[PDB]
Swiss-Prot record:
Homodimer. Forms a heterotetramer composed of two Mre11 subunits and two Rad50 subunits. Homodimerization is promoted by ATP binding. Belongs to the SMC family. RAD50 subfamily. Keywords: ATP-binding, Coiled coil, DNA damage, DNA repair, Hydrolase, Metal-binding, Nucleotide-binding, Zinc. This is DNA double-strand break repair Rad50 ATPase. GO terms for molecular function: ATP binding; ATP hydrolysis activity; identical protein binding; zinc ion binding. Part of the Rad50/Mre11 complex, which is involved in the early steps of DNA double-strand break (DSB) repair. The complex may facilitate opening of the processed DNA ends to aid in the recruitment of HerA and NurA. Rad50 controls the balance between DNA end bridging and DNA resection via ATP-dependent structural rearrangements of the Rad50/Mre11 complex. The ATP-bound conformation promotes DNA end binding and end tethering, and alters Mre11 nuclease activity. ATP hydrolysis promotes both Mre11 activity as well as HerA/NurA activity. Also has reversible adenylate kinase activity. GO terms for biological process: double-strand break repair. It holds the Pfam family AAA_21.
Length: 301
């Protein structure tokens, strides 16, 4: 899946936001409170309405203000360009209008009935809900939680993936994938990460000199590298392949190398951050700022 264009009108601080996405790493940059994460949220809801994204309530779309709330997402998947349009009307005569069309030549045509249920049903076939919200979308805090502790890690795994028979196999596979990725991250310094399952506790080890070692055995960058390797391994386990990554703001140097080496091999990456240092590591730079109480976009690269 490849996002192309997102238009958000009257959702949170986005009065009239239009963003064009392209191949490679797309960096959305700006100070805190600019509305980047909310734009991501808008994309997610735009894709998977009326399913629950995070703790977002439908009211934010259906019952705020007098002006229409408008979400318009254009994306490509398997050669076909799709366009989802959701319009929420306010006031006395309030309601909802939902459409999903595909591009035939130079004209948009409905892929299904213009209703929430049908569009949802279609999207479930196009890209299942749990896939996007776990394989594609990397929510902020998950890496930390992975690197926090065994219980937290267990929490993250349980969150991302969802009867221990499948749990074990899943963690084994994820172990393999994570080994493979972490082997790349550390340039072969390590070749095997061990993911052990226990009663409400997922243990994560790295092998050194044949013997296993815990998180503290690693350097500062090696740990974050391991966390990323694990999370990405889980994504890969879920999707079977990584074509699109949407990265919520990573906690505020190894990120640069992780971007330069790994993420640039991915067809499309959407990254949100306030860190200017990342600009050189991106293929396309979109700057967003809060002005007069509304988000404002400018294209840099």
């Amino acid at each position: 899946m490849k996002l192309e264009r997102v238009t958000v009108k009257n959702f949170r601080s986005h009065s009239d936001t239009v963003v064009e996405f392209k191949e490679g790493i797309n960096l959305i940059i700006g100070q805190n409170g600019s509305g980047k994460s909310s734009l991501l949220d808008a994309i997610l809801v735009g894709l998977y309405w009326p399913l629950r994204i995070k703790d977002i309530k439908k009211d934010e779309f259906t019952k705020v203000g007098a002006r229409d709330t408008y979400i318009d997402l254009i994306f490509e998947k398997d050669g076909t360009k799709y366009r989802i349009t959701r319009r929420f009307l306010k006031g006395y005569s309030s309601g909802e209008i939902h459409a999903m069309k595909r591009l035939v030549g130079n004209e948009w045509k409905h892929v299904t009935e213009p209703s929430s249920k049908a569009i949802s049903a279609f999207m479930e076939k196009l890209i299942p809900y749990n896939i996007f919200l776990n394989a594609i979308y990397i929510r902020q805090g998950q890496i930390d939680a992975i690197l926090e502790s065994d219980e937290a890690r267990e929490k993250v795994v349980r969150e991302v993936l969802n009867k221990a028979l499948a749990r074990e196999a899943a963690l084994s596979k994820i172990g393999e994938l994570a080994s493979e990725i972490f082997a790349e991250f550390t340039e072969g310094k390590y070749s095997e990460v061990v993911v052990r399952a226990e009663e409400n506790k997922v243990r994560l080890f790295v092998v050194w000199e044949g013997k296993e070692r815990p998180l503290t055995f690693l350097s500062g960058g090696e740990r974050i590298a391991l966390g990323w390797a694990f999370r990405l391994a889980m994504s890969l386990y879920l999707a079977g392949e990584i074509s699109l990554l949407i990265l919520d703001e990573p906690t505020p140097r190894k990120l640069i190398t992780i971007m330069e080496r790994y993420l640039k091999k991915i067809p499309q990456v959407i990254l949100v951050s306030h860190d200017e240092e990342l600009k050189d590591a991106a293929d396309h730079v979109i700057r967003i700022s809060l002005e007069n109480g509304s988000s404002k976009v400018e294209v840099v690269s």
